[PDB]
């Protein structure tokens, strides 16, 4: 059992870490056997390694990340809505997914699922 | 794989049917071998009859259901922020989950996992 407070605390640390470009910080919320599937329909990315590299390439550009609503948490899972904003060769993109976490006994995240399609990327 | 236009429409039908009390409305969107976890934590309800049972239980009082944001649709999946509101014995309640659908190739919803906690409910 995880406390909704704790699960919710992790989300922010994650959000803050994507904002801070803090790769060590984001990855250390993830179980050794954890997996990132982001966006959905990608083969899931299994293990600390692939997870680290996946967030490393997420950060090549500076990111602006914010929760657009209150985090939902019940049982061992977190869901939240958010925006990722960045600029590349003078063009701005705001991606707006819903992510989903599942936590294990030890407090860490064991799965991540970020759902978003073309209607969810904007300028 | 399914279309995000069809998936995004189906979330609008669902939500529309929960506002009009349309019980046949909401059920028809689901596969026969589908499951409803609402809230995440409880025992799944399985199959058209269990699914029906559940949604008639939800419509015991008039509901005000609305999408609070753009729907996310991809793969054969869709996620949607919403709020459910009702009044009982003077006591207004707002419930603000994040829902999730998974689909089959037939266009029908197989999984539904509504995910909300106590912090996502206000009553006064």
Q: Do B52 and B23 touch, CB atoms closer than 8 A?
A: yes
Q: Which of A40, A70, A96 faces B70 most closely, judged by CB atoms?
A: A96
Q: Which of A69, A75, A117 faces B73 most closely, judged by CB atoms?
A: A117
Pairing assessment for the beta strands B77-88 and A91-95 based on DSSP bridges = unpaired
- How distant is the alpha carbon of residue A113 from its chain centre? 8
Contacts of B118 in chain A (CB under 8 A): 4, 74
SS3 state at B35: strand
- Give residue numbers after which chain B breaks (C–N above 2.5 Å): none
Q: Do A18 and A58 touch, CB atoms closer than 8 A?
A: yes
Residue whose pair of structure tokens reads 């299994």 in the numeric block: A46
Distances (CA, A) of B72 to A60, A100, A114: 25, 12, 10
Which of 3.10.450.50, 3.50.40.10, 3.40.50.970, 3.30.930.10 is the CATH number of B1-124? Answer: 3.10.450.50
| Binary contact (B77, A120; C-beta < 8 A) | no
Contact A74/B at CB under 8 A: yes
Mark which residues 52-71 of A lie under 8 Å from B by CB.
68-70
Contact B23/A at CB under 8 A: no
Number of H helices, E strands in chain A: 3, 9
Q: What resolution does the deposited structure have, in angstroms?
A: 2.5
Contact B121/A at CB under 8 A: no
Distance from CA of A62 to the nearest CA of B (A): 24
Fold (CATH) for A1-123: Nuclear Transport Factor 2; Chain: A, (3.10.450)
Domain limits of chain A? Answer: 1-123
Structure determined by: X-ray
Q: Do A84 and A67 touch, CB atoms closer than 8 A?
A: no
Non-local (6+) Cβ contacts of A110 within 8 A are: A30, A31, A33, A34, A35, A102, A103, A104
Contact A79/B at CB under 8 A: yes
Number of H helices, E strands in chain B: 3, 9
Residue whose pair of structure tokens reads 């990132």 in the numeric block: A36
Q: Which of B4, B78, B97 faces A72 most closely, judged by CB atoms?
A: B97
């Amino acid at each position: 059992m995880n406390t909704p407070e704790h699960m919710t605390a992790v989300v922010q640390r994650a959000v803050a870490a994507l904002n801070a470009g803090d790769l060590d910080g984001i990855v250390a919320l993830f179980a050794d056997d954890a997996t990132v599937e982001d966006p959905v329909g990608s083969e899931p990315r299994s293990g600390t390694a692939a997870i680290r590299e996946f967030f490393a390439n997420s950060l090549k550009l500076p990111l602006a990340v914010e929760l657009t609503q209150e985090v939902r948490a019940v049982a061992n899972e977190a869901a939240f809505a958010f925006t990722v904003s960045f600029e590349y060769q003078g063009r701005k993109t705001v991606v707006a997914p819903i992510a989903h976490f599942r936590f294990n006994g030890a407090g860490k995240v064991v799965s991540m699922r970020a759902l978003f399609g073309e209607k969810n990327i904007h300028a």
